[PDB]
Amino acid sequence: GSSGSSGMEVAPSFSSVLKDCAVIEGQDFVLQCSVRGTPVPRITWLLNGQPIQYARSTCEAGVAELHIQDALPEDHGTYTCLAENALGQVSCSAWVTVH
């Protein structure tokens, strides 16, 4: 036998990666996805480059969300949601379009 305890940590992963989405200039759009892991991986969104500073992201029940109000024509790019923890590290990309 071997001593052990139930309820061990886990590595980060994306069950439902982000998908393409379109929105009208001036409208609101929140990027919702699914990510698992333990402990909860760090959620940081970036605009095809540097991380966002005015992002009120909200991770609940392993659900990373990013509310983006005032969809500007200069936002149309590729949102990257990095998720890493003491266990592993993973990242995903997305494609948001602004009419």
From Swiss-Prot:
Cleavable signal peptide: none
Q: According to the UniProt record, which cysteines are disulfide-bonded?
A: C33-C81
- PTM section of the record: Can probably be down-regulated by phosphorylation. Tyrosine phosphorylation by ABL1 increases kinase activity, reverses MLCK-mediated inhibition of Arp2/3-mediated actin polymerization, and enhances CTTN-binding.
Tissue-wise, where is it found? Answer: Smooth muscle and non-muscle isozymes are expressed in a wide variety of adult and fetal tissues and in cultured endothelium with qualitative expression appearing to be neither tissue- nor development-specific. Non-muscle isoform 2 is the dominant splice variant expressed in various tissues. Telokin has been found in a wide variety of adult and fetal tissues. Accumulates in well differentiated enterocytes of the intestinal epithelium in response to tumor necrosis factor (TNF).
Q: Which residues carry this modification: Phosphotyrosine?
A: Y54
Where it sits in the cell: the answer is: Cytoplasm; Cell projection, Lamellipodium; Cleavage furrow; Cytoplasm, Cytoskeleton, Stress fiber
Which ranges carry the Ig-like C2-type domain?
A: 12-97
Q: What induces it?
A: Accumulates in individuals with asthma (at protein levels). Induced by tumor necrosis factor (TNF). Repressed by androgens (e.g. R1881).
State the similarity comment.
Answer: Belongs to the protein kinase superfamily. CAMK Ser/Thr protein kinase family.
Q: How does it assemble?
A: All isoforms including Telokin bind calmodulin. Interacts with SVIL. Interacts with CTTN; this interaction is reduced during thrombin-induced endothelial cell (EC) contraction but is promoted by the barrier-protective agonist sphingosine 1-phosphate (S1P) within lamellipodia. A complex made of ABL1, CTTN and MYLK regulates cortical actin-based cytoskeletal rearrangement critical to sphingosine 1-phosphate (S1P)-mediated endothelial cell (EC) barrier enhancement. Binds to NAA10/ARD1 and PTK2B/PYK2.
Instruction: Recite the other comments.
Output: In asthmatic patients, overexpression promotes actin filament propulsion, thus contributing to airway hyperresponsiveness. Some MYLK variants may contribute to acute lung injury (ALI) susceptibility. Potential therapeutic target in the treatment of burn edema.
Its function, per the record, reads: Calcium/calmodulin-dependent myosin light chain kinase implicated in smooth muscle contraction via phosphorylation of myosin light chains (MLC). Also regulates actin-myosin interaction through a non-kinase activity. Phosphorylates PTK2B/PYK2 and myosin light-chains. Involved in the inflammatory response (e.g. apoptosis, vascular permeability, leukocyte diapedesis), cell motility and morphology, airway hyperreactivity and other activities relevant to asthma. Required for tonic airway smooth muscle contraction that is necessary for physiological and asthmatic airway resistance.
Disease the record associates with this protein: Aortic aneurysm, familial thoracic 7: A disease characterized by permanent dilation of the thoracic aorta usually due to degenerative changes in the aortic wall. It is primarily associated with a characteristic histologic appearance known as 'medial necrosis' or 'Erdheim cystic medial necrosis' in which there is degeneration and fragmentation of elastic fibers, loss of smooth muscle cells, and an accumulation of basophilic ground substance.
Task: Report what the protein is called.
Answer: Myosin light chain kinase, smooth muscle
Give the organism, scientific name.
Homo sapiens
Gene (UniProt) = MYLK
